[PDB]
Amino acid sequence: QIQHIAIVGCVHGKYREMYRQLSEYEKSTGKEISFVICTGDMQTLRYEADLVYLKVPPKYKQMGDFHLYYEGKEKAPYLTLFIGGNAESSNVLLHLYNGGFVCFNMYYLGVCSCININGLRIVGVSGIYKSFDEKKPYTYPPSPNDVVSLFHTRNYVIQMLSNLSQSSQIDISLSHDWPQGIVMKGNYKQLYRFQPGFKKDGASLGSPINKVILNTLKPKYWISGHMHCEYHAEEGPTHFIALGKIGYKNAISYLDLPLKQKTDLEYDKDWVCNLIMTWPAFSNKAQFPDLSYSISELLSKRTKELDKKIIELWEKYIGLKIIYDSDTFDIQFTSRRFYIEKIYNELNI
RNA sequence: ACA
Ligand SMILES: [Fe+2]
Ligand SMILES: [O-]
Ligand SMILES: [Zn+2]
Numbered sequence: 001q002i003q004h005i006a007i008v009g010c011v012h013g014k015y016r017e018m019y020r021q022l023s024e025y026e027k028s029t030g031k032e033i034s035f036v037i038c039t040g041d042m043q044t045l046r047y048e049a050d051l052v053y054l055k056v057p058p059k060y061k062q063m064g065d066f067h068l069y070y071e072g073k074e075k076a077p078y079l080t081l082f083i084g085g086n087a088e089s090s091n092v093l094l095h096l097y098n099g100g101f102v103c104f105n106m107y108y109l110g111v112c113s114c115i116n117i118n119g120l121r122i123v124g125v126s127g128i129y130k131s132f133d134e135k136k137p138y139t140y141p142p143s144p145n146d147v148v149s150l151f152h153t154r155n156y157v158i159q160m161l162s163n164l165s166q167s168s169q170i171d172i173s174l175s176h177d178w179p180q181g182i183v184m185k186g187n188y189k190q191l192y193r194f195q196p197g198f199k200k201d202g203a204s205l206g207s208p209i210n211k212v213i214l215n216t217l218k219p220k221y222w223i224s225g226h227m228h229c230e231y232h233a234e235e236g237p238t239h240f241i242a243l244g245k246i247g248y249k250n251a252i253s254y255l256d257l258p259l260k261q262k263t264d265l266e267y268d269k270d271w272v273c274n275l276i277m278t279w280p281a282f283s284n285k286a287q288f289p290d291l292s293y294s295i296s297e298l299l300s301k302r303t304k305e306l307d308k309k310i311i312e313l314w315e316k317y318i319g320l321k322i323i324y325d326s327d328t329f330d331i332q333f334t335s336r337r338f339y340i341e342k343i344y345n346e347l348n349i
Numbered sequence: 350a351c352a
Contacts (some may be wrong), residue, residue: 012350017352041350056350128351148352177351226351245350 001215003034003118003259005172006078007217009225009251012087013064019077025254034118034259036078038177039225039243040085040126042160044102045218046070050089054145055151060087069103075312076105079265082216083109084126085226086332090150091142093126095329098275104324109174112157113275114164114268115322121258121268123161123217124174127153128226129207137287141330153209159295160278162216162300164270171257177226178206182240186233192249195229214238221255239313265322272314273307274299279344283338306347313343 006022026033044066045051051061066089068074084093094104099110109115109124116122133152142150164170183191183198183205192199206224214222214235221239231242231252244251278298281289289295314320317339325332 010350060350130351228350 002256003253004031005034005255005257006036007223007241007243007255008036008038008246010041010085010087010228010245011038011043012041012060012245013045013062013066015065015069015076015245016074018252021246021252022078025252031254033078036080037122037172037174037223038080038082039174039223040083041225041245042066042082042086043083043087043089044070044092044106044108046092050091053089053091053142053147053150054087055090055147056087061112066102069106072104076103080106081109081115081122081124081265082106083124083174083176084151086128086151088151090147092329094138094140094142094150095333097138097333098340100240100329100336101324101334102329107322109301111154112160114161114170114271114300116263116266116268118263120171120257121164121168122172122174123164123170123213123219124210125153125157125161125210125213126176128177129150129195129209131155134209135291137289137291139287140285140333149218151200154297155205155209156289156291158209158212158216159299160274161213163274163299164268165217167270170217171221173214173217173219173222173226175207175210175213175222177210178224178231178242179222179235179240180204180206180211182206182214182222182233183231183234185235185240186231191229191231195227244296266320267314267318267322269307269311273302273310276314276340276343276347277302279340282337283341301349306349309347310343313346317342
């Protein structure tokens with residue numbers, strides 16, 4: 001029994017073209033797509049006003065296709081899980097920093113998170129690395145003065161994700177830019193013949209944040225995009241795969257993984273516990289996280305009986321199943337934070 | 350389409 005998982009590189013607002021090429025895969029091969037994974041640059045602009053938050057050169061200031069799906073004029077045929085890249089409607093993703101559906105069958109994993117589906121544990125890391133913004137907190141509500149910084153990966157995601165491989169392994173991990181140094185772990189001489197600009201960066205190419213997470217979690221697969229080219233490498237037990245952008249080949253590949261059981265999209269229990277136990281660092285809605293707290297220290301308070309109480313309370317107020325919510329993203333920001341605060345306060349710690 |  002096999003599940004077929006589609007992995008997609010940069011979309012850049014060409015959703016109808018992506019789904020057309022996914023639909024033709026099913027009709028030409030006869031295989032069924034379980035769900036779709038996207039590595040970022042989604043450009044989930046609801047309407048014209050969201051163009052302010054799209055940090056791209058002037059020639060790429062385009063609405064794209066997402067608004068057709070947001071308005072219900074188009075319907076995504078497959079469940080699509082994605083992270084954020086550097087070309088995003090960054091205000092939308094900040095409202096959904098704890099993850100959420102931007103529209104039917106399109107689920108944003110948030111700034112970072114782990115999810116469950118078909119017996120798999122999938123980790124996502126949004127954004128691209130810039131050293132001068134890795135210590136910067138998020139300010140809320142989103143402001144046009146932060147269009148240049150909202151998509152930069154923060155350092156604190158390392159401490160948020162480092163313990164996720166204690167109970168069981170991670171099957172798939174998602175990042176937009178490559179883990180730093182991974183370029184040297186494949187056929188880099190061939191990559192340089194096709195992308196001569198990558199050679200000057202050497203082993204420093206990519207994100208050091210994603211390098212640390214890869215070495216810590218060591219998932220079965222690490223999938224990245226951003227660089228608009230095909231690449232594959234092996235970092236110990238981890239299969240690295242990079243994908244191009246929609247409109248060109250090597251933008252979509254397919255993982256054929258064993259299917260232990262078919263299961264709906266669910267929150268990862270270990271991630272849910274991390275989310276609740278770090279609430280004090282995120283309790284100030286106007287600026288988070290407050291790194292006067294130590295994320296590691298907050299997470300060191302996890303116990304077996306506390307984790308059991310959190311899942312019981314999470315299932316009560318939110319539920320283990322990740323279900324579609326059509327409230328406006330500012331309402332979902334407040335709603336999800338309301339129940340994280342409520343669960344934490346009922347733990348009495 | 351890093352900036
Ligand atoms: Fe990108
Ligand atoms: O990209
Ligand atoms: Zn791209």
